[PDB]
């Protein structure tokens, strides 16, 4: 039953998002926390109640959760609060989520007892336990060789997370595995720096334009270096080598913008 | 193609290397097209950049030197990248080009540019600025940060006197002009009429005011976030909440009659709301430099 997978990537990807809600909400208008997963793709379960995506805005929410790195996160934090006292309770939010749509979470993440003391590392936490889970489940999914997942699964992974239908790059999806006889596997700890790196690549844009406007050849040390920079995290040669085999269409070694960097930003974008 | 505006305002070389005055670049900062190359051998070259120290280490540092400096094609994308750099990629940048971890930038890291330089087929004026006369003198954190600031704030003093026409005051209608510099000419007539309408005398505005407009519009993507969360939430954003925004954004008030004047602009229908859309659009066609 293809015809029903292919259909929902164009809505899920492209359409407005309360016409990915009422595609995938069932009780009437609400979603449960696992008619979220299948809206996200073609335990805090638990955690999230039967409260949950009452005008389709805790989807935005999430989703923002979900597309947000961490300056911009703090600033979120920022224009949570009001007063700017450094904490945001359950009703300060009420005050903006009612803003936004013009409570299972609240009761939750902020506070028992309607007391909601919330400081920095608290929504960090949140994000972060969130994401991981996230990513925990697209590595699942794919059911890792003892958590080792296959070349053309991660390369699967990284043009579901690009979203553009390349068929150039589908086509070189398939040969990874006939370019690289030998696969050891991708463990979940180079997807968990690597996709940490893809999160905040508009922050790597900075370097990558200063490199970016005088020439086009990235190489690896360059992309480890800003890496274990920005994001502080390790990328082991095996991926970059996945990511060289993988995005460079034209061979001629190293990366320019619009084979890999430009198609990145424009999925932070929209 | 970034090499043909360096090819248009060269006018001085050496060895068959173009290379351009501290004036010519400002003009590739400011002005479109315009000289002639004259040939420097080593004599001219002591002549002209001897005494780089006689110069302030301020915000008139160009203007301090003004044709005295010569400027290679690696600084001047160099300069060129200072010029479109936000403020939070400023330790990100000094880090990248931190490869030996010593906390400096030193000599190595210019000739690794001019290693990418080469590999995309003398003694300049940054080099005695950050290095000295050979590169034995280092170069740290503090005074990068300030000679960054420094530069970006001088471009805005000098776009300030250009379209303040010499003033230490601007009025709105050169504050509109300033703003509507790259825009498409249809769009910039319907904003005329907007001007010739809907805006009014109001008041004077000064030096500070543009400046924390010009920080403003070098952080207009960590601002798109709740333009985007009250776009596909589809609230037309008002301007007390456009407000509280500009000032999480920038961490500056700015005045209320910027905010009122931007408000007359990007307001066509009049209706007492925001068309983010094509602000923003055509706001990162504006705030595009290397053009």
Known sequence: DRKVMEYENRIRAYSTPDKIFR???????????????????????????????ISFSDYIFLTTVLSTPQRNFEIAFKMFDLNGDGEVDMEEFE?????????????????????????????????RKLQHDVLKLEFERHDPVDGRITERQFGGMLLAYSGVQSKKLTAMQRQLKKHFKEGKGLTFQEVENFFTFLKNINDVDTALSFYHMAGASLDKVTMQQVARTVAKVELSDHVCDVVFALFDCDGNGELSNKEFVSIMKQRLMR | ?????????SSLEHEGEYYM??????????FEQMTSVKKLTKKDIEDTLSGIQTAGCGSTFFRDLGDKGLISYTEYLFLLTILTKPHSGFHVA????????????????????????????????????????????????????????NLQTE??????????????FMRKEDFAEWLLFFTNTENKDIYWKNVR???????????????????????????????????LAHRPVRLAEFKRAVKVATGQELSNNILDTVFKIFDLDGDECLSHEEFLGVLKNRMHRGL
């Open chain 2, 197 to 231: 309408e809907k805006l009014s005398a109001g008041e004077s505005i000064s030096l500070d005011e543009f400046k924390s407009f010009c920080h403003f519009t070098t952080h207009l993507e960590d601002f798109a976030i709740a333009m985007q969360m009250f776009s």
């Open chain 1, 23 to 53: 595609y995938f909400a069932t009780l009437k208008v609400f979603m449960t926390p696992e008619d979220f997963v299948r809206s996200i793709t073609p335990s805090i379960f638990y955690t999230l109640g039967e409260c949950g995506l």
């Open chain 2, 1 to 9: 193609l970034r090499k043909q505006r360096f090819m248009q305002f």
């Open chain 2, 94 to 149: 000094f880090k990248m080009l931190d490869t030996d971890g010593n906390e400096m930038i030193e000599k190595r890291e210019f000739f690794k540019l001019q290693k990418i330089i080469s590999k995309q087929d003398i003694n300049t004026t940054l080099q005695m600025r950050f290095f000295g006369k050979r590169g034995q003198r280092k170069l740290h954190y503090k005074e990068f940060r300030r000679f960054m600031e």
């Open chain 2, 21 to 30: 005055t501290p004036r010519d670049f400002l003009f590739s900062v400011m």
């Open chain 1, 95 to 127: 005050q903006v989520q009612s803003i936004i749509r013009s409570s299972a979470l609240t009761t939750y993440f902020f506070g028992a007892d309607l007391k909601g003391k919330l400081t920095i590392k608290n929504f960090l936490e949140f994000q």
């Open chain 2, 155 to 168: 471009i805005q003093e000098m776009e300030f006197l250009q379209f303040s026409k010499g003033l230490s």
